[PDB]
Amino acid sequence: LTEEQIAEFKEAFSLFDKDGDGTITTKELGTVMRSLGQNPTEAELQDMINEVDADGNGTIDFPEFLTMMARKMKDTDSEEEIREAFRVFDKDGNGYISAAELRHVMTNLGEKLTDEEVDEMIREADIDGDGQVNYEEFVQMMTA
Numbered sequence: 001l002t003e004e005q006i007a008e009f010k011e012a013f014s015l016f017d018k019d020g021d022g023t024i025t026t027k028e029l030g031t032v033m034r035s036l037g038q039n040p041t042e043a044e045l046q047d048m049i050n051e052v053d054a055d056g057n058g059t060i061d062f063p064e065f066l067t068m069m070a071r072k073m074k075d076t077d078s079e080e081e082i083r084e085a086f087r088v089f090d091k092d093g094n095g096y097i098s099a100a101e102l103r104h105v106m107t108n109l110g111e112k113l114t115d116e117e118v119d120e121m122i123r124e125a126d127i128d129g130d131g132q133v134n135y136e137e138f139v140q141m142m143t144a
């Protein structure tokens, strides 16, 4: 386990934890999912959270979030949701996520990232070196 993998999980947690209180609620999960073209019901949001909510408190904290990711890395069923996430980042549908597309999507998600931070994200996910993130590279970024 490296500092960087922790920092990537932390970056992902803060994207869902909109108010920074340390827990992800159904409302925060719901607003992030709608920003990615989804429309989950109140019942689906509660069921999604209950699957990963180890205690009964109804919200996801940082350890639960990490356990959620470790289970999903062992269970290779969630390809569909990664494909659906790819569709939102790849705005023009050409098979590549450009830095401009990532910048636009992160700004939509209420994220104040510098242009260098956006570039860093593209470069870290980029495997072939073309300066863009194709589907295969997006999968590897999501699943490690």
Ligand SMILES: Clc1ccc(C(c2ccc(Cl)cc2)[n+]2ccn(C[C@H](OCc3ccc(Cl)cc3Cl)c3ccc(Cl)cc3Cl)c2)cc1
Pocket (backbone or CB within 6 Å): 005, 008, 009, 011, 012, 013, 015, 069, 089, 097, 102, 121, 122, 125, 133, 138, 141, 142, 143, 144
């Ligand atoms: Cl060991 C390990 C470490 C990290 C990951 C993933 C990840 C993906 C989704 C979730 Cl819910 C949690 C973690 N990961 C890689 C990078 N980022 C930060 C990343 O941001 C970097 C990024 C790079 C390239 C591209 Cl094209 C998009 C993004 Cl968002 C990001 C990805 C997905 C979401 Cl929903 C939120 C975030 Cl902040 C997280 C997986 C395994």
Ligand SMILES: Clc1ccc(C(c2ccc(Cl)cc2)[n+]2ccn(C[C@H](OCc3ccc(Cl)cc3Cl)c3ccc(Cl)cc3Cl)c2)cc1
Pocket (backbone or CB within 6 Å): 016, 024, 029, 032, 033, 036, 038, 048, 049, 052, 060, 065, 068, 069, 072, 073, 078, 081, 082, 084, 085, 142, 143, 144
């Ligand atoms: Cl943007 C996004 C975020 C997560 C996923 C997948 C996933 C699956 C395997 C691996 Cl190794 C990495 C990621 N995943 C992980 C967890 N959930 C369940 C649920 O996913 C909801 C979801 C579905 C589709 C899309 Cl496009 C986005 C989301 Cl957030 C969820 C996500 C985040 C939190 Cl904080 C809590 C939950 Cl319960 C899905 C796909 C797209």
Ligand SMILES: [Ca+2]
Pocket (backbone or CB within 6 Å): 016, 017, 018, 019, 020, 021, 022, 023, 024, 025, 028
């Ligand atoms: Ca919160």
Ligand SMILES: [Ca+2]
Pocket (backbone or CB within 6 Å): 053, 054, 055, 056, 057, 058, 059, 060, 061, 064
């Ligand atoms: Ca909890």
Ligand SMILES: [Ca+2]
Pocket (backbone or CB within 6 Å): 089, 090, 091, 092, 093, 094, 095, 096, 097, 098, 101
């Ligand atoms: Ca594109």
Ligand SMILES: [Ca+2]
Pocket (backbone or CB within 6 Å): 126, 127, 128, 129, 130, 131, 132, 133, 134, 137
């Ligand atoms: Ca590439």
